Amino acid sequence: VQLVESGGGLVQPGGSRKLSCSASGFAFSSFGMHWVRQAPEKGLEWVAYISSGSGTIYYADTVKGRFTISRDDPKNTLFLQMTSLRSEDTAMYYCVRSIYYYGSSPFDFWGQGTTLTVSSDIVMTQATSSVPVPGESVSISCRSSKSLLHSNGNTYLYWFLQRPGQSPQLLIYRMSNLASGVPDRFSGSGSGTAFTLTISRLEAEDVGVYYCMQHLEYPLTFGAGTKLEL
Amino acid sequence: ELDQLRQEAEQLKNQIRDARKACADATLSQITNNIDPVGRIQMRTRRTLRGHLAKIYAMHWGTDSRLLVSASQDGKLIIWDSYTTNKVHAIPLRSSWVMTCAYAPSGNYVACGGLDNICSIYNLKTREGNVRVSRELAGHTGYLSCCRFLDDNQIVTSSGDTTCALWDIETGQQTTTFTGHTGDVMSLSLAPDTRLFVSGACDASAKLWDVREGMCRQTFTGHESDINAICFFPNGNAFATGSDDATCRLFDLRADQELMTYSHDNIICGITSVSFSKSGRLLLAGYDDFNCNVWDALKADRAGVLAGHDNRVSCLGVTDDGMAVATGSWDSFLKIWN
Amino acid sequence: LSAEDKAAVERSKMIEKNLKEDGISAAKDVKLLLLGADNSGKSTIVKQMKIITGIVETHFTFKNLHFRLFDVGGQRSERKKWIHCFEDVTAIIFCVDLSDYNRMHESLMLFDSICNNKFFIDTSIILFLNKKDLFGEKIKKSPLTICFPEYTGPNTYEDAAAYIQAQFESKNRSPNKEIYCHMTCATDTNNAQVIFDAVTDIIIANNLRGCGLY
Amino acid sequence: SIAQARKLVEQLKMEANIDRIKVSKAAADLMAYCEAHAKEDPLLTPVPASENPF
Amino acid sequence: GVLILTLLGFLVAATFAWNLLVLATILRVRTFHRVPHNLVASMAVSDVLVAALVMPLSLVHELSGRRWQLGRRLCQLWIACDVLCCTASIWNVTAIALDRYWSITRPMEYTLRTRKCVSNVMIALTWALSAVISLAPLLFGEECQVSREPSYAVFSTVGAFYLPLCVVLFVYWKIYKAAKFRVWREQKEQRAALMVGILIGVFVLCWIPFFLTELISPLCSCDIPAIWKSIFLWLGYSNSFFNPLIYTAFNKNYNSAF
Ligand SMILES: CCN(CC)C(=O)N[C@H]1C=C2c3cccc4[nH]cc(c34)C[C@H]2N(C)C1
């Protein structure tokens, strides 16, 4: 599985650029796709989403009427058209795949992004900003403005980890489940409005920033991020 | 010696019949005579799953009591979500002639087979977001009738060449072969402890097998026609069978003989499938007259009728938590009762 | 419904379209069942068959229709356990070799069971008599008395062949079934035309009996 | 035929030497399991519509 | 004379119930959701509508001597319901004949989607045409008569009964020839000719006596006694009784469900 993004560079304010991504190693037509950007002095932010079959398109409130998202299935390509570029659009743009059925794990693969430089919502709060910490146990916390427990019995909470100089990866989905290729020392628990992530027997390569996301309703919102340092 | 051996064979057969007679002192009907009847049982149709375009031949529940798989002569395998009637997967089959399917206890594999004489194994949870064939098992000289999973690496199959086998999926070979039947083996059932299993064939007999040693323990003969279905008691010391002579019978292991016969004068059609309840007080059977009957397993009395199909009922099923019963038919429909 | 619940419902809709398209593309086919004893000419009944020990399927295209032929001879088991899988076929093709006096009284035995089967009450039969040339050269040695003992007639070429045809047709006792008979050699190439014409007469007859004429 | 007949006799002997119990004892065992799990069978005692997921 | 009131009431009541049962069977039973069955449903609806309101008001007019003695703006809803609800029955018989014709002459081409498409085209033009022929003398133009204008008696009569009659006769002649040519033998041949004779015979004598007078009188100069006229009129109405007999009583898949 591989996702490669192309485009980016320096663009004058008020201009227009086009970004693309290439997929290889999986079935591209059965996956939904997302765009997520990260400002140089901020965290992750959701941008747009196009569904499988191109039947549904969603946009963030701050890119409505300016950005456009489209896909090409025969050539296995995803697009993004940007117009009227302001200085707040300078970030690194990622491409994420997700599938939706009973028991699936969405947001499971991320790609390496491309840099671009230009010359009623739910609020998730992560109080901790930095924690100094081997061979021990640590706990992280996240909070929600409204209960994420739906009437069907599912809590829609997600966790991520971003090592230095790398792309974020999935750790826990739906507040309890453990993703594939992740050591069992990661655990998740909590209730409505109160969640916690526990790491036992801490080792190296576990340093970075942790994010909490909700998937209850659009738009999708992220947390500020808690950093772990030696 | 070509005739002396025959004489000894008849002598041993008479010893078995006399030994069983000494173990019979009272019948099950006499013992359970002072028990209040269950009463009248009425069930309604809660869901109706549509999407198949031909006859439906088999189905199987999952261990989570929410997912199920079904097979049809249109060359498709469909996995359903019974709670919301959502379709999860649709797997095209290379051979359209299918007779059996199975669902692994873990939930990562399904099985298929039919007139091609190959058991095929499909991998559900994998990268690339699609279902691909994992293994093809070859070696049977006849059609496959039934198959059941033991683990993610072992499976037991019955076929029309009068044999049963146990396979190793990674190696692709069969470790053990079970022989002794004279006619085509049609049905199969596993014990809760998965150390023994029972089979029924067209020679009007049933046999008990040992999975490890690959030997035969006991043989049961009480019918007058072919045997199509078989199922274990939840306790694990009894099983039931259905035949083409419009009759179900209950057999015991420790006593090693028949205990009850279920029959009525208004039924002259064969029986396609049988199943038990969670407690074991109810026996459910599907018939050729488009209906499904409910029997009292301890008193041999009818309790209810499930009539919602326009053609022959082919297969039955009860969830592990005993909350629903599913039925399939030749009219491309399957329904969930409660 | 939540955000993920709506996405799952959309997935089921796309699966329902692929299933609908495949059903349309399958209804425009003609399904035929191929039966007969070994060494009877089943494998070479149509010159332009293309194969696409279980079940063997051969398909060819003629005019505009698509034909699918299923051969079941590798199943040495009880036929009654799987004969109902082919209940909805258009017709049955039967092949008989006339140069073999040993397979006789076994081809007749197999023909009787098919014609008087519960699932094939109103299914027509297209009957092929093969190797008429070698049968004609053989009659100069064996005057058909070896195979059929109760035979009395001038056995040059025709009264022998007419006798064999009359033996097979006497096995049918039904008013809604017709038997089509044709004699072929090893070099005849117009077998697809014979099958095409027989099927056309079958569909016409089925339409009349739906409007109260037959 | 000698080999086939010898195997048949060797199979009957194994099945003709086992331990069997009375029908009355086995019938009682079948009863006891039924009243033990009678209250946990939804198909006998239907649950209220609040706890029914269908 | 007293029993005549009951006899006509027997015909009125039986027709309404008989065709309603046909509609219930098609909608309820799942084996009757095929292409050759939508047309027979549309014929039942037209016969129900005739028995529901068209017939009972005809009796009241006949019962009330010859005069109307009722209020206007109501017979306008009565004249328009005798032309729409009777033409539909005539043109639904034609739709059945055309479908059967193409199933015998073109068996490999008139099937699956093409048959479903063409069948639904006919079931639409059969209702639009009857609406045009009914509201034309109202939207475009005591005792409540239809029209004595000669410009109207040669447009409705030809366009509702005479043109369909030519089509029905031509089709069934071809079917009879095809059945005879394609081959016990005596029993089958006798049944083939008998069935067609029932179809044409009922359709002709039930409509041809009334429709001849409707053309001669506006052109020639002669009236007819009301005794003869009354007998003629009820012959046509009595075709919503045979219709649901012949086209469904002598078929197996129907009698199976009685
Ligand atoms: C209720 C009206 N009255 C009482 C005065 C009738 O005498 N009505 C008659 C006229 C008819 C007619 C005339 C012209 C064209 C037509 N197309 C179809 C019809 C028709 C039906 C036919 N009806 C059955 C009988």
PDB file of C-alpha atoms in Angstrom, chain B residues 149-317:
ATOM      1  CA  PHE B 149     -14.583 -25.327  10.756  1.00  0.00           C
ATOM      2  CA  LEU B 150     -12.654 -26.410  13.849  1.00  0.00           C
ATOM      3  CA  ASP B 151     -10.002 -23.669  13.953  1.00  0.00           C
ATOM      4  CA  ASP B 152      -8.459 -21.224  11.502  1.00  0.00           C
ATOM      5  CA  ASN B 153      -6.274 -24.091  10.234  1.00  0.00           C
ATOM      6  CA  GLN B 154      -8.546 -27.168  10.303  1.00  0.00           C
ATOM      7  CA  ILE B 155     -11.752 -28.097   8.479  1.00  0.00           C
ATOM      8  CA  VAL B 156     -13.833 -31.267   8.059  1.00  0.00           C
ATOM      9  CA  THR B 157     -15.684 -32.110   4.838  1.00  0.00           C
ATOM     10  CA  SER B 158     -18.114 -34.789   3.679  1.00  0.00           C
ATOM     11  CA  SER B 159     -18.596 -35.806   0.060  1.00  0.00           C
ATOM     12  CA  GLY B 160     -20.521 -38.043  -2.335  1.00  0.00           C
ATOM     13  CA  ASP B 161     -17.734 -40.623  -2.685  1.00  0.00           C
ATOM     14  CA  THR B 162     -18.743 -42.177   0.676  1.00  0.00           C
ATOM     15  CA  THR B 163     -15.846 -40.652   2.643  1.00  0.00           C
ATOM     16  CA  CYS B 164     -15.052 -37.883   5.113  1.00  0.00           C
ATOM     17  CA  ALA B 165     -11.751 -36.080   5.560  1.00  0.00           C
ATOM     18  CA  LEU B 166      -9.865 -33.624   7.764  1.00  0.00           C
ATOM     19  CA  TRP B 167      -7.628 -31.042   6.095  1.00  0.00           C
ATOM     20  CA  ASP B 168      -4.701 -28.783   6.951  1.00  0.00           C
ATOM     21  CA  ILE B 169      -5.259 -25.434   5.261  1.00  0.00           C
ATOM     22  CA  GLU B 170      -1.670 -24.156   5.135  1.00  0.00           C
ATOM     23  CA  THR B 171      -0.291 -27.424   3.752  1.00  0.00           C
ATOM     24  CA  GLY B 172      -3.333 -28.104   1.570  1.00  0.00           C
ATOM     25  CA  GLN B 173      -3.341 -31.828   2.397  1.00  0.00           C
ATOM     26  CA  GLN B 174      -5.747 -34.054   4.313  1.00  0.00           C
ATOM     27  CA  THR B 175      -4.356 -35.559   7.518  1.00  0.00           C
ATOM     28  CA  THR B 176      -7.057 -38.187   8.137  1.00  0.00           C
ATOM     29  CA  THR B 177      -9.628 -40.031   6.020  1.00  0.00           C
ATOM     30  CA  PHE B 178     -12.764 -41.586   7.524  1.00  0.00           C
ATOM     31  CA  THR B 179     -14.205 -44.657   5.792  1.00  0.00           C
ATOM     32  CA  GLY B 180     -16.986 -47.151   6.405  1.00  0.00           C
ATOM     33  CA  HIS B 181     -20.134 -45.705   4.860  1.00  0.00           C
ATOM     34  CA  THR B 182     -21.718 -47.448   1.871  1.00  0.00           C
ATOM     35  CA  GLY B 183     -23.814 -44.606   0.439  1.00  0.00           C
ATOM     36  CA  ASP B 184     -23.314 -40.908  -0.167  1.00  0.00           C
ATOM     37  CA  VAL B 185     -22.637 -38.870   2.972  1.00  0.00           C
ATOM     38  CA  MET B 186     -25.082 -35.967   3.146  1.00  0.00           C
ATOM     39  CA  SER B 187     -24.869 -34.289   6.572  1.00  0.00           C
ATOM     40  CA  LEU B 188     -22.389 -33.608   9.358  1.00  0.00           C
ATOM     41  CA  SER B 189     -22.335 -32.146  12.869  1.00  0.00           C
ATOM     42  CA  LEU B 190     -19.656 -31.235  15.421  1.00  0.00           C
ATOM     43  CA  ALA B 191     -19.644 -31.626  19.195  1.00  0.00           C
ATOM     44  CA  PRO B 192     -19.270 -28.621  21.527  1.00  0.00           C
ATOM     45  CA  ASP B 193     -15.878 -29.937  22.695  1.00  0.00           C
ATOM     46  CA  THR B 194     -14.835 -30.637  19.064  1.00  0.00           C
ATOM     47  CA  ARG B 195     -13.363 -34.066  19.815  1.00  0.00           C
ATOM     48  CA  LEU B 196     -16.080 -36.137  18.095  1.00  0.00           C
ATOM     49  CA  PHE B 197     -18.486 -35.699  15.203  1.00  0.00           C
ATOM     50  CA  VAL B 198     -21.439 -37.565  13.711  1.00  0.00           C
ATOM     51  CA  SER B 199     -22.428 -38.229  10.098  1.00  0.00           C
ATOM     52  CA  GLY B 200     -25.446 -39.526   8.208  1.00  0.00           C
ATOM     53  CA  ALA B 201     -25.607 -41.059   4.734  1.00  0.00           C
ATOM     54  CA  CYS B 202     -27.859 -42.664   2.104  1.00  0.00           C
ATOM     55  CA  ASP B 203     -27.414 -46.163   3.572  1.00  0.00           C
ATOM     56  CA  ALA B 204     -29.907 -45.196   6.322  1.00  0.00           C
ATOM     57  CA  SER B 205     -27.328 -45.209   9.109  1.00  0.00           C
ATOM     58  CA  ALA B 206     -25.407 -42.800  11.321  1.00  0.00           C
ATOM     59  CA  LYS B 207     -21.863 -43.158  12.635  1.00  0.00           C
ATOM     60  CA  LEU B 208     -19.843 -41.604  15.458  1.00  0.00           C
ATOM     61  CA  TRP B 209     -16.232 -40.696  14.679  1.00  0.00           C
ATOM     62  CA  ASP B 210     -13.168 -39.804  16.745  1.00  0.00           C
ATOM     63  CA  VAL B 211     -11.292 -36.792  15.392  1.00  0.00           C
ATOM     64  CA  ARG B 212      -7.865 -37.659  16.815  1.00  0.00           C
ATOM     65  CA  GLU B 213      -7.534 -41.424  16.330  1.00  0.00           C
ATOM     66  CA  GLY B 214      -9.677 -41.413  13.177  1.00  0.00           C
ATOM     67  CA  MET B 215     -11.686 -44.494  14.173  1.00  0.00           C
ATOM     68  CA  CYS B 216     -15.378 -45.384  14.405  1.00  0.00           C
ATOM     69  CA  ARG B 217     -17.023 -45.786  17.813  1.00  0.00           C
ATOM     70  CA  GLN B 218     -20.736 -46.530  17.331  1.00  0.00           C
ATOM     71  CA  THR B 219     -23.227 -46.999  14.495  1.00  0.00           C
ATOM     72  CA  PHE B 220     -26.964 -46.260  14.645  1.00  0.00           C
ATOM     73  CA  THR B 221     -29.592 -47.777  12.324  1.00  0.00           C
ATOM     74  CA  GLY B 222     -33.290 -47.062  12.789  1.00  0.00           C
ATOM     75  CA  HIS B 223     -34.590 -45.463   9.592  1.00  0.00           C
ATOM     76  CA  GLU B 224     -36.052 -46.666   6.289  1.00  0.00           C
ATOM     77  CA  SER B 225     -34.711 -44.128   3.762  1.00  0.00           C
ATOM     78  CA  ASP B 226     -31.982 -41.555   3.159  1.00  0.00           C
ATOM     79  CA  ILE B 227     -30.736 -39.248   5.922  1.00  0.00           C
ATOM     80  CA  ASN B 228     -30.444 -35.542   5.103  1.00  0.00           C
ATOM     81  CA  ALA B 229     -29.880 -33.672   8.387  1.00  0.00           C
ATOM     82  CA  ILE B 230     -28.267 -34.192  11.788  1.00  0.00           C
ATOM     83  CA  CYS B 231     -27.621 -32.118  14.915  1.00  0.00           C
ATOM     84  CA  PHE B 232     -26.167 -32.482  18.419  1.00  0.00           C
ATOM     85  CA  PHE B 233     -27.864 -31.903  21.741  1.00  0.00           C
ATOM     86  CA  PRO B 234     -26.334 -28.984  23.687  1.00  0.00           C
ATOM     87  CA  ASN B 235     -25.350 -31.413  26.452  1.00  0.00           C
ATOM     88  CA  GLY B 236     -23.381 -33.503  23.953  1.00  0.00           C
ATOM     89  CA  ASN B 237     -24.784 -36.980  24.696  1.00  0.00           C
ATOM     90  CA  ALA B 238     -27.605 -37.115  22.129  1.00  0.00           C
ATOM     91  CA  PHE B 239     -28.357 -36.183  18.532  1.00  0.00           C
ATOM     92  CA  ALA B 240     -31.314 -36.056  16.146  1.00  0.00           C
ATOM     93  CA  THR B 241     -31.740 -36.994  12.484  1.00  0.00           C
ATOM     94  CA  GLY B 242     -34.219 -36.418   9.687  1.00  0.00           C
ATOM     95  CA  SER B 243     -35.035 -38.669   6.756  1.00  0.00           C
ATOM     96  CA  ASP B 244     -37.122 -38.823   3.584  1.00  0.00           C
ATOM     97  CA  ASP B 245     -39.734 -41.052   5.268  1.00  0.00           C
ATOM     98  CA  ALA B 246     -41.251 -38.019   7.069  1.00  0.00           C
ATOM     99  CA  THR B 247     -39.839 -38.923  10.470  1.00  0.00           C
ATOM    100  CA  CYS B 248     -37.369 -37.555  13.011  1.00  0.00           C
ATOM    101  CA  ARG B 249     -35.650 -39.738  15.599  1.00  0.00           C
ATOM    102  CA  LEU B 250     -33.636 -39.094  18.760  1.00  0.00           C
ATOM    103  CA  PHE B 251     -30.603 -41.238  19.586  1.00  0.00           C
ATOM    104  CA  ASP B 252     -28.637 -41.584  22.820  1.00  0.00           C
ATOM    105  CA  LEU B 253     -24.917 -42.288  23.075  1.00  0.00           C
ATOM    106  CA  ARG B 254     -24.472 -43.981  26.462  1.00  0.00           C
ATOM    107  CA  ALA B 255     -27.544 -46.185  26.006  1.00  0.00           C
ATOM    108  CA  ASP B 256     -26.590 -46.570  22.315  1.00  0.00           C
ATOM    109  CA  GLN B 257     -30.121 -46.829  20.902  1.00  0.00           C
ATOM    110  CA  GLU B 258     -33.139 -44.777  19.834  1.00  0.00           C
ATOM    111  CA  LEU B 259     -35.266 -42.871  22.358  1.00  0.00           C
ATOM    112  CA  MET B 260     -38.132 -41.150  20.505  1.00  0.00           C
ATOM    113  CA  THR B 261     -39.867 -40.946  17.125  1.00  0.00           C
ATOM    114  CA  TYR B 262     -41.552 -37.778  15.832  1.00  0.00           C
ATOM    115  CA  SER B 263     -44.216 -38.357  13.183  1.00  0.00           C
ATOM    116  CA  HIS B 264     -47.737 -37.402  12.155  1.00  0.00           C
ATOM    117  CA  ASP B 265     -50.360 -38.810   9.804  1.00  0.00           C
ATOM    118  CA  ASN B 266     -50.753 -35.533   7.865  1.00  0.00           C
ATOM    119  CA  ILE B 267     -47.105 -35.366   6.696  1.00  0.00           C
ATOM    120  CA  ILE B 268     -45.863 -37.502   3.802  1.00  0.00           C
ATOM    121  CA  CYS B 269     -43.005 -35.278   2.613  1.00  0.00           C
ATOM    122  CA  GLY B 270     -39.305 -35.405   3.370  1.00  0.00           C
ATOM    123  CA  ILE B 271     -37.290 -33.405   5.882  1.00  0.00           C
ATOM    124  CA  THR B 272     -34.512 -31.055   4.774  1.00  0.00           C
ATOM    125  CA  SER B 273     -32.991 -29.697   8.003  1.00  0.00           C
ATOM    126  CA  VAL B 274     -33.181 -29.978  11.797  1.00  0.00           C
ATOM    127  CA  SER B 275     -32.047 -27.782  14.679  1.00  0.00           C
ATOM    128  CA  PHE B 276     -32.331 -27.504  18.458  1.00  0.00           C
ATOM    129  CA  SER B 277     -33.009 -24.714  20.929  1.00  0.00           C
ATOM    130  CA  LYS B 278     -30.594 -23.333  23.507  1.00  0.00           C
ATOM    131  CA  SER B 279     -32.142 -25.329  26.356  1.00  0.00           C
ATOM    132  CA  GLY B 280     -32.974 -28.383  24.249  1.00  0.00           C
ATOM    133  CA  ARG B 281     -36.732 -28.468  24.898  1.00  0.00           C
ATOM    134  CA  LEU B 282     -37.604 -27.594  21.278  1.00  0.00           C
ATOM    135  CA  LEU B 283     -36.779 -29.307  17.979  1.00  0.00           C
ATOM    136  CA  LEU B 284     -37.248 -27.411  14.708  1.00  0.00           C
ATOM    137  CA  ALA B 285     -37.505 -29.117  11.317  1.00  0.00           C
ATOM    138  CA  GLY B 286     -37.994 -27.920   7.740  1.00  0.00           C
ATOM    139  CA  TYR B 287     -40.142 -29.831   5.264  1.00  0.00           C
ATOM    140  CA  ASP B 288     -40.892 -30.065   1.547  1.00  0.00           C
ATOM    141  CA  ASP B 289     -44.459 -28.746   1.991  1.00  0.00           C
ATOM    142  CA  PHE B 290     -43.186 -25.134   2.335  1.00  0.00           C
ATOM    143  CA  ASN B 291     -43.585 -25.085   6.145  1.00  0.00           C
ATOM    144  CA  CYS B 292     -41.582 -25.589   9.336  1.00  0.00           C
ATOM    145  CA  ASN B 293     -42.779 -27.483  12.412  1.00  0.00           C
ATOM    146  CA  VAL B 294     -41.898 -27.173  16.102  1.00  0.00           C
ATOM    147  CA  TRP B 295     -41.830 -30.318  18.238  1.00  0.00           C
ATOM    148  CA  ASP B 296     -41.670 -30.922  21.980  1.00  0.00           C
ATOM    149  CA  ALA B 297     -38.450 -32.903  22.343  1.00  0.00           C
ATOM    150  CA  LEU B 298     -39.506 -34.665  25.562  1.00  0.00           C
ATOM    151  CA  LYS B 299     -43.163 -35.491  24.810  1.00  0.00           C
ATOM    152  CA  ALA B 300     -43.277 -35.873  20.985  1.00  0.00           C
ATOM    153  CA  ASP B 301     -46.076 -33.343  20.477  1.00  0.00           C
ATOM    154  CA  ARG B 302     -46.442 -30.556  17.933  1.00  0.00           C
ATOM    155  CA  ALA B 303     -46.266 -27.003  19.269  1.00  0.00           C
ATOM    156  CA  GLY B 304     -46.288 -24.563  16.348  1.00  0.00           C
ATOM    157  CA  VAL B 305     -45.945 -23.957  12.626  1.00  0.00           C
ATOM    158  CA  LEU B 306     -43.829 -21.407  10.733  1.00  0.00           C
ATOM    159  CA  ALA B 307     -45.446 -20.791   7.327  1.00  0.00           C
ATOM    160  CA  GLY B 308     -44.176 -17.887   5.238  1.00  0.00           C
ATOM    161  CA  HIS B 309     -42.495 -19.426   2.193  1.00  0.00           C
ATOM    162  CA  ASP B 310     -43.784 -20.080  -1.321  1.00  0.00           C
ATOM    163  CA  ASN B 311     -41.348 -22.930  -2.071  1.00  0.00           C
ATOM    164  CA  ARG B 312     -39.289 -25.610  -0.351  1.00  0.00           C
ATOM    165  CA  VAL B 313     -37.524 -24.766   2.911  1.00  0.00           C
ATOM    166  CA  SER B 314     -33.877 -25.748   2.460  1.00  0.00           C
ATOM    167  CA  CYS B 315     -32.011 -24.718   5.616  1.00  0.00           C
ATOM    168  CA  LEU B 316     -32.499 -23.649   9.240  1.00  0.00           C
ATOM    169  CA  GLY B 317     -30.436 -21.987  11.952  1.00  0.00           C
TER     170      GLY B 317
END
